[PDB]
Write a protein that binds this ligand. Structure first.
Ligand SMILES: Nc1ncnc2c1ncn2[C@@H]1O[C@H](COP(=O)(O)OP(=O)(O)OP(=O)(O)O)[C@@H](O)[C@H]1O
Ligand SMILES: Nc1ncnc2c1ncn2[C@@H]1O[C@H](COP(=O)(O)OP(=O)(O)OP(=O)(O)O)[C@@H](O)[C@H]1O
Ligand SMILES: [Mg+2]
Ligand SMILES: [Mg+2]
Lengths: 270, 91, 86, 745, 222
């Protein structure tokens, strides 16, 4: 007996998330309403016409069993109902995986073809057939309550005009969290990456959190707010775990701004 | 002119000489004499050179006019590793 | 000094610097500085040039960057405390 | 201006006051110009006495549009009325670059005859301003040999002529200058690429990659938790060390290694020894000579083909390859023949040399010449006469094709006979109708295969959506193999036509996906070849993932083609991710000799020339098509339509056709005396700069390197400083730099 | 502006065409992890669902009478049960060892396939799959340090033949130390970029766990 050899390189899912999928039409330039943009749009249109005619013909002389709605119905029949929710423990092969159900019992099952195999990573929530436990899908994990806790859903109403006297501070923070997003061409032409991190320090009530609110008002990036004392957890390793998950959520919603307010409170308070 | 041929010859870049160099010789001579004088005229060892005239390999036995050589003809020098007889005897 | 000059060359490679930037002088101006401080000096020189709406960073910009990073930020430097640990 | 204004807004401005147009507004005159074009389309011949004021309106509108940086809007006006000719009259020195750039960007989509019309108009604008390098590029896009000669001899600047000679040598176009022309010697040497080997070796020494690489360093078997194996390893050794002149495995005593291969493997392995000596004719033949005297039938002909591989891409004034290969094209042994014609074709690709073609042509008609030999002869004679529409080659290929029996045409080597024919008329367009009429008399299903092949080769790199529609109609009707052979050619033809411009290629990627999804095996056995052709040396992740999804395909031919396409797509890119995928496939396909051989081939291609070579047929900012590179890629890919019998069979030497497509992804800056000149440059992904006015950046995500740097696909390079002025705007290949008078003022 | 009306007309036509194409082909769902229909091998999926039976993961505990022709294997099926089973006819007796994970059927629980050892998913994700974008050319002033690091962590892997011949056992551990910002993690990223073997990044704070002995378990599984 020989162990199976996967054909996919690595064990992690595809990094790209939430793309245009099959609607990734080529970027036509220039955006100006000129005849060259017109010609590029016509070329895309002719390729779409050819594609449409070809697909219509193929589906026309395809068998009654092999039709888009018929194949979708067959996929539903293959999945069956209900579809159990298990945990992807290991990817043994391209079409074989060890998955653990909610009762803690593991099974060496087969991954069916219609499963999005690039969405499979260890620990991901998978959907399995009720009877044979074969992997029939991958469950799009719902937003964590902690993800909701960090993310600032509505931008604060405090703007830069509501801040008085912090002209230099506003300029310095804009050069690091606002200008790199609105005008990246400055940094690209200068050959430097923007200033990596920014810490606002000063006596209480001076306007550090007010400036952070003003940044959150006029930012196109996801804003995550965390108080330093929130990083102190009740269990060992839960603090590092929370920090790791906070920056994982920051990476998920890129571009993003992570505001670790009152950071010193992690150490000054016991 | 007067039965003397202007043969422009090409030298390998290893011998860092003027690649656009000229040889002058009779045509009654044969490929053996031409090869020997080509080796002498630019400081080369005769045993390890192949000669290319008129986009054809220089047959050594046949004389130049019966070879097909003419005036202002291009020549090419090939450095050889292992002699023809020694390469043939090698295996 | 040689290592700091090398780091300055590494981080200012893609910079739109002037023609006569004395990177050896800049390396001499920050005796005990980590490579991160040198990268920040390059970035802050670029930021000084950008703030003045200039596409090329002069030597004066690098001098102000050294003053801001090596000197002004020296209160927060992790270096003096951490070389006792190493 | 407010309502439709059909034949109205023009009319009152035409009959009313005829004062300066811009006095009535920019928007009003824009609407007036649009209406002018609309009614110009309506007007017939009998209304030629109706355009008297219209010419005045356009002659006043064009300078007005150029005054307010609305040059692109001006361009549409003369484009619609098909009267771009007077544009060159009103071009100023502040806008020639923008108008020429826009017109050139438009040419990829307008069909004939507006194709050549726009091309010649932009060429005239460039010529008026003495922008000789871009004028030469534009003429090369027009394949107008007379115009190439006129542009080359019109310029009085010797340095500009040297840069133009470098461009011509890269493109594979050669000129026979007159001895009266000053600096004839060096110009001819530049155009003949005799110094290409020395420049490449100097680069490699500078880029400290001169050390030879054993195929073990590519396989990396120590990280992994036969005759075919040896032949694959020889191919990897040839590909990785291509054009380097040194190898630890064949440049040493390679007799043990060379005899480690068996049967036709010895054919390729010895021929592989010519790959390391690519472009190094003088030194390469010095190593071929030792194996030229081998008694074994395969070794001598392998060295014969290695001769042509060595001479490929470089034009030697005293033809060595012809001399060494002429005496073996009618040899009694078919293997000595096979090596000789293929080497001669590789050595003189894109030359249209009448002497070589006359020496080679009777070989196809020889009785002793097998079908393999006839196909090889067709491939060669096509490669010499690629895009030339040679009458002799066409006539003899037609004679050979119709002389063969119907059962003889069942052999897949006959598939090479139209290809060379197709190579003869590569990119010519509508010059195949006589050829198609001649092919109509050929029996079927070979007639459909031949017709598809020649038609595609004629419309290669044109983007003609009509021909793509015809090819998709051919692909539509599937047959429950023997009758469906030409479907794979049509699938390859979609790529061969759509490769011209980026939008068409990205659009055709979806069509290739649909062909892989709905198509039959023979239909889907060619989609990987189409993906490789349309994205060669361009390892974009979409095509790589698509090919990976089918690497372990149920159909063995689909698997082989997908693996080879993965290799070709990242060929010469040295892609780390693709190398990891290929290693994983080698582990997965360990017990499958054919799939493992394909994986080794892909690994060898991925590190072609140690990452310093490219197989992409497009240079000069992906606007100039290299006909020799297209011919080599076409040879290999069409031979891959029968990978079971040709590649995996006894005819793997056809892979050396890729030698015709090997060029260095180069940026070497030379002084005015042709010595190397290191300069700081910025290399970054190319950015389209059509439309947006002012000075837009043409590169994004760039880095600063010294000039001896390798440019990836789609990566432009701009001089970082202004100390030097480039002779040509395109910073690819060999570029000459001149000291800027403004710098250090 | 003269082309604007035609621009919008052709753009709307293109959007309608794209929607129409997606109607016949697919691209939908994506919340239940459905692959695009171009990859649906439904007949093979049905054949797999019928022929390929599910296998419960158990752990072999003891082999009784391994010498004779009737060896019985005590398996511990996770949270399910414990059984005394026998190997299937398609598994060699020497392919199953005590203490290794196996996969058995649901009817007679006969051992059907030996399985890889269980590894924590958090440990599995610790291995680097995307190499960093830092080379040794991005580290300045550390010539001797980089050379010493490479001749321990890179050279023995690249060219082991230079070490076995002289009976040489290369060092198997390197500690990079220095003040913050000096380039320790930069050099580690350079190593991970240049390396070809499996590279695993472990942060010390990741080895701190809530429960007793869990960190040692993660180290053992690593
Ligand atoms: N410079 C200022 N201009 C205008 N309003 C200000 C300024 N500084 C503070 N404020 C007001 O004071 C309020 C409270 O200050 P804020 O919470 O921003 O201070 P802080 O420096 O972040 O303090 P802490 O250290 O206590 O977190 C703000 O919401 C804002 O309305
Ligand atoms: N020798 C160096 N050459 C070039 N750049 C350097 C060098 N040392 C540090 N840098 C720069 O400074 C940054 C400091 O980050 P780095 O990961 O190297 O720090 P570190 O030594 O691991 O610090 P810490 O001990 O806080 O983890 C690097 O990302 C790099 O950009
Ligand atoms: Mg606060
Ligand atoms: Mg660190």
């Amino acid at each position: 007996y020989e162990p199976p050899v996967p054909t996919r390189v690595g064990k992690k899912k595809k990094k790209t998330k939430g793309p245009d999928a099959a609607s990734k039409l080529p970027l036509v330039t220039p955006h100006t309403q000129c005849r060259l943009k017109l010609l590029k749009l016509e070329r895309i249109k002719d390729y779409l016409l050819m594609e449409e005619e070809f697909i219509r013909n193929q589906e026309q002389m395809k068998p009654l069993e092999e039709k888009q709605e018929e194949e979708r119905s067959k996929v539903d029949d293959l999945r069956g109902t209900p579809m159990s929710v298990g945990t992807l423990e290991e990817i043994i092969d391209d079409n074989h995986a060890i998955v653990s159900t909610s009762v803690g019992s593991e099974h060496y099952v087969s991954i069916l073809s219609f499963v999005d195999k690039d969405l499979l990573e260890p620990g991901c929530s998978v959907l399995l057939n009720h009877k044979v436990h074969a992997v029939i899908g991958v469950l799009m994990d719902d937003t964590d309550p902690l993800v909701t806790v960090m993310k600032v859903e509505k931008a604060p109403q405090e703007t830069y005009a509501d801040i008085g006297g912090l002209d230099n501070q506003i300029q310095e923070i804009k050069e690091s969290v606002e200008l790199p997003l609105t005008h990246p061409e400055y940094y690209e032409e200068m050959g430097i990456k923007p200033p990596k991190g920014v810490i606002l320090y000063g006596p209480p009530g001076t306007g550090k959190t007010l400036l952070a609110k003003a940044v959150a008002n006029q930012t196109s990036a996801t804003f995550l707010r965390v108080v330093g004392s929130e990083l102190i957890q009740k269990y060992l390793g839960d603090g590092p775990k929370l920090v790791r998950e906070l920056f994982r959520v920051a990476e998920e919603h890129a571009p993003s701004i992570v505001f670790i307010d009152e950071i010193d409170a992690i150490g000054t308070k016991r | 002119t007067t039965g003397i041929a202007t043969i422009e010859v090409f030298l390998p870049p290893r011998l860092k000489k003027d690649r656009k160099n000229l040889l002058e010789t009779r045509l009654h001579i044969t490929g053996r004499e031409l090869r020997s004088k080509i080796a002498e005229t630019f400081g080369l060892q005769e045993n390890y050179i192949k000669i290319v005239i008129n986009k054809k390999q220089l047959q050594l036995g046949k004389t130049l006019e019966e070879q097909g050589v003419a005036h202002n003809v291009k020549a090419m020098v090939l450095e050889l590793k292992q002699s023809e007889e020694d390469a043939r005897k090698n295996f | 000094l040689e290592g700091r000059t090398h780091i300055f060359k590494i981080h200012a490679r893609s910079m739109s610097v002037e023609r006569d930037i004395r990177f050896e002088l800049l390396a001499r101006l920050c005796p005990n500085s980590t490579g991160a401080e040198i990268r920040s000096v390059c970035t802050e020189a670029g930021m000084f040039a950008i703030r003045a709406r200039r596409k090329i960073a002069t030597e004066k910009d690098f001098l102000e960057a050294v003053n801001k990073v090596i000197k002004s930020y020296a209160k927060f430097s992790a270096t003096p405390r951490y070389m006792t640990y190493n | 201006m407010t309502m439709s204004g059909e034949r109205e807004c023009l009319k009152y401005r035409l009959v009313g006051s005829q004062e300066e147009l811009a006095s009535w507004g920019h928007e009003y005159v824009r609407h007036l110009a649009g209406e002018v074009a609309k009614e110009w389309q309506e007007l017939d011949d009998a209304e030629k006495v109706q355009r008297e004021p219209l010419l005045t309106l356009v002659k006043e509108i064009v300078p007005y549009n150029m005054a307010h940086n609305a040059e692109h809007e001006a361009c549409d006006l003369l484009m619609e009325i098909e009267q771009v000719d007077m544009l060159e009259k009103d071009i100023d020195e502040n806008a020639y670059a923008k108008v020429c750039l826009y017109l050139t960007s438009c040419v990829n989509y307008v069909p004939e005859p507006e194709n050549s019309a726009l091309l010649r108009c932009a060429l005239g604008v460039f010529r008026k301003f003495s922008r000789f390098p871009e004028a030469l590029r534009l003429a090369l896009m027009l394949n107008d040999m007379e115009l190439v000669e006129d542009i080359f001899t019109s310029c009085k600047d010797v340095v500009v002529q040297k840069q133009m000679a470098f461009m011509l040598g890269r493109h594979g176009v050669f000129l026979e200058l007159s001895e009266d022309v000053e600096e004839y010697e060096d110009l001819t040497e530049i155009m003949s690429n005799v110094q290409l080997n020395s420049n490449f070796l100097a680069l490699a020494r500078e880029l400290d990659i001169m050390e030879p690489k054993v195929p073990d360093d590519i396989y990396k078997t120590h990280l992994e938790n036969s005759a075919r194996m040896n032949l694959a390893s020889s191919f990897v050794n040839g590909f990785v060390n291509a054009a380097f002149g040194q190898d630890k495995l064949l440049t040493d005593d390679g007799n043990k290694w060379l005899y480690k291969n068996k049967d036709h493997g010895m054919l390729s392995a010895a021929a592989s020894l010519g790959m390391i000596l690519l472009w190094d004719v003088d030194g390469g033949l010095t190593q071929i000579d030792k194996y030229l005297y081998s008694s074994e039938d395969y070794i001598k002909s392998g060295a014969l083909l290695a001769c042509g591989i060595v001479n490929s891409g470089v034009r030697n004034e005293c033809d060595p390859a012809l001399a060494l290969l002429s005496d073996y094209v009618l040899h009694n042994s078919n293997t000595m023949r096979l090596g000789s014609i293929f080497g001669l074709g590789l050595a003189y690709a894109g030359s249209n040399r009448e002497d070589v073609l006359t020496l080679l042509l009777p070989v196809m008609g020889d009785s002793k010449s097998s079908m393999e030999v006839a196909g090889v002869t067709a491939l060669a004679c096509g490669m010499i006469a690629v895009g030339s529409c040679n009458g002799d080659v066409t006539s003899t290929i037609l004679q050979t094709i119709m002389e063969k029996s119907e059962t003889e045409l069942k052999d897949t080597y006959a598939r090479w006979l139209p290809l060379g024919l197709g190579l003869n008329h590569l990119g010519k367009g509508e010059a195949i109708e006589a050829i198609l009429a001649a092919l109509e008399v050929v029996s079927e299903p070979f007639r459909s295969f031949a017709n598809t092949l020649v038609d595609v080769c004629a419309y290669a790199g044109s983007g003609n959506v009509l021909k793509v529609q015809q090819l998709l109609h051919i692909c539509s009707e599937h047959f429950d193999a023997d009758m469906g052979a030409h479907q794979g050619v049509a699938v390859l033809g979609i790529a061969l036509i759509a490769m011209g411009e980026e939008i068409g290629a990205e659009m055709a990627l979806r069509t290739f996906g649909h062909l892989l999804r709905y198509g039959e095996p023979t239909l889907r056995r060619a989609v990987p070849l189409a993906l490789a052709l349309i994205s060669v040396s361009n390892p974009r992740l979409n095509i790589l993932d698509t090919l990976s999804k089918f690497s372990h395909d149920a159909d063995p031919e689909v698997s082989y083609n997908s693996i080879f396409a993965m290799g070709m797509v990242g060929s010469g890119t040295n892609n780390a991710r693709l190398a990891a995928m290929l290693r994983q496939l080698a582990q997965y396909h360990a017990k499958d000799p054919n799939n493992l051989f394909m994986v080794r081939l892909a690994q060898g291609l991925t590190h072609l020339g140690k990452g310093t070579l490219t197989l992409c047929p497009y240079h000069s900012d992906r606007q100039l098509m290299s006909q020799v590179a297209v011919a080599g890629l076409l040879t290999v890919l069409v031979s891959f339509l029968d990978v079971r019998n040709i590649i995996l069979g006894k005819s793997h030497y056809v892979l050396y056709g890729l030698v015709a497509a090997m060029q260095p992804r180069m940026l070497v800056t030379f002084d005015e005396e042709l010595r190397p000149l290191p300069v700081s440059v910025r290399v970054g992904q190319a950015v389209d700069v059509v439309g947006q006015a002012g000075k837009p950046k043409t590169i994004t995500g760039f880095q600063t390197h010294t000039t001896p740097v390798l440019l990836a696909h789609g990566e432009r390079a701009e001089l970082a400083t202004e100390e030097f002025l480039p002779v040509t705007p395109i910073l690819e290949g060999f570029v000459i730099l001149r000291k800027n008078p403004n710098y250090d003022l | 502006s003269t082309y604007s009306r035609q621009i919008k007309q052709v753009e709307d036509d293109i959007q309608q065409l794209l929607k129409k194409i997606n109607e016949l082909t697919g691209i939908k769902e994506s919340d239940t992890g459905l692959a695009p229909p171009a990859l649906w091998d439904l007949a093979a999926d049905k054949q797999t669902l019928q022929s390929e039976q599910p296998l419960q993961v158990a752990r072999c505990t003891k082999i009784i009478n391994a010498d004779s022709e009737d060896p019985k294997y005590i398996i511990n099926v996770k949270q399910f049960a414990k059984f005394v089973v026998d190997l299937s006819d398609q598994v060699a007796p020497t392919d199953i060892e005590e203490g290794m994970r196996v996969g058995v059927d649901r009817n007679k629980y006969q051992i059907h396939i030996p399985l890889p050892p269980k590894i924590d998913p958090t440990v599995t994700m610790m291995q680097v799959e995307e190499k960093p974008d830092v080379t040794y050319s991005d580290v300045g002033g550390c010539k001797e340090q980089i050379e010493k690091l490479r001749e321990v962590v890179e050279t023995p892997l690249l060219h082991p033949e230079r070490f076995v011949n002289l009976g040489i056992e290369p060092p198997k551990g390197v500690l990079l130390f220095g003040p913050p910002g000096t380039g320790k993690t930069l050099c580690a990223r350079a190593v991970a970029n240049r390396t070809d073997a499996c590279f695993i990044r472990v942060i010390g704070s990741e080895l701190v766990q809530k429960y007793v002995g869990e960190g040692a378990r993660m180290v053992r599984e690593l």
